[PDB]
């Protein structure tokens, strides 16, 4: 599969990304508040990654 997919992607030719783009938060709140107010305001920032659709079903 690997030796033939290179042949498939290379027999077409090259492609420029500037014409390809025609068809197709973490460190911001710390810059305003000091370190004494950011240390309680980070744990829920470490908790909302669990709130992305995957890591809830066992814990």
């Amino acid at each position: 599969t690997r030796r033939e997919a290179i042949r498939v992607l290379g027999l077409l030719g090259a492609l420029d990304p500037y014409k390809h783009k025609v068809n197709i938060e973490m460190l911001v709140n710390m810059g305003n508040l000091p370190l004494d107010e950011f240390y309680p305001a980070v744990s829920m920032v470490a908790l909302m990654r669990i709130f992305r659709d995957q890591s809830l079903s066992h814990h």
């Binding site: 460190l27 710390m30 810059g31 370190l35 950011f38 240390y39 309680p40 980070v42 744990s43 920032v45 470490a46 908790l47 990654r49 669990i50 890591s55 066992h58 814990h59």
Partner: protein, 235 residues
């Protein structure tokens, strides 16, 4: 959280990638209990369940642990950082070790005193091996504002062809004309920037004074095959 700090720092017994990724997880677990703020304790129960939890709050648990000890074990922390990337460089481990030196310099307490050099050469070469070209330009203004030496500006031309920014490397040749001279101008800049017309005078005045250098002989013979003059090259 005081006596047990002198155990997981000077290990130096890491061979396989399981051990290299197991060291950072218990290091992130050790950085939690030292902070006096109770907001860092709630994630310790979730770190045993969720395995990438070490990649979530390691920035906030570093300054609160570094600014707690009585200025005695900070040098041991510096030696634990420096001896972690000495040999057997794994890419994401070096990414984690360069992300540890990121949260500190956004504050008003100064950057991290790694090597008493603020992390220029040691983490920059690891970021260059990990292909972090946005990180490779950060210490360039550190090297420029601390004394221009002739081993600085010759390294920025190699990180521009894979960055595809030709205007950033085109402001380099005329900078050495009215500030540096002629003795500090080499033929390295003309080769990687893909021109072979104006440099032929430089190759003729360089290769005729000294002996026939092999690398300059390989560079001189591209002047006939990149422009389309295959008549003299066969001779």
């Amino acid at each position: 959280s005081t006596i047990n700090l002198q155990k997981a720092w000077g290990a130096a017994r890491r061979v396989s990638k399981d051990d290299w990724l197991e060291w950072l997880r218990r290091l992130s677990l050790e950085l939690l209990k030292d902070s006096s703020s109770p907001s860092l304790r709630s994630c310790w129960a979730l770190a045993q369940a969720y395995n990438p939890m070490a990649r979530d709050l390691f920035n906030a648990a570093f300054v609160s642990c570094w600014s707690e000890l009585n200025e005695d074990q900070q040098d041991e922390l510096i030696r634990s950082i420096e001896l972690a990337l000495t040999s057997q460089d794994i890419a994401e481990v070096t990414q984690t070790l360069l992300n540890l030196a990121e949260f500190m310099e956004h504050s008003d307490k100064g950057p991290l005193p790694l090597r008493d050099d603020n992390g220029i050469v040691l983490l920059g070469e690891r970021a260059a091996k990990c292909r972090a070209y946005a990180k490779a330009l950060h210490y360039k203004e550190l090297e420029f504002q601390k004394g221009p030496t002739p081993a600085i500006l010759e390294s920025l031309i190699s990180i521009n062809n894979k960055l595809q920014q030709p205007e950033a490397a085109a402001g380099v040749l005329e900078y050495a004309m009215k500030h540096f001279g002629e003795l500090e101008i080499q033929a390295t800049w003309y080769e990687k920037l893909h021109e072979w017309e104006d440099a032929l005078v430089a190759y003729d005045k360089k290769m005729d004074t000294n002996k026939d250098d092999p690398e300059l002989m390989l560079g001189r013979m591209r002047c006939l095959e990149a422009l389309g003059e295959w008549g003299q090259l066969h001779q």
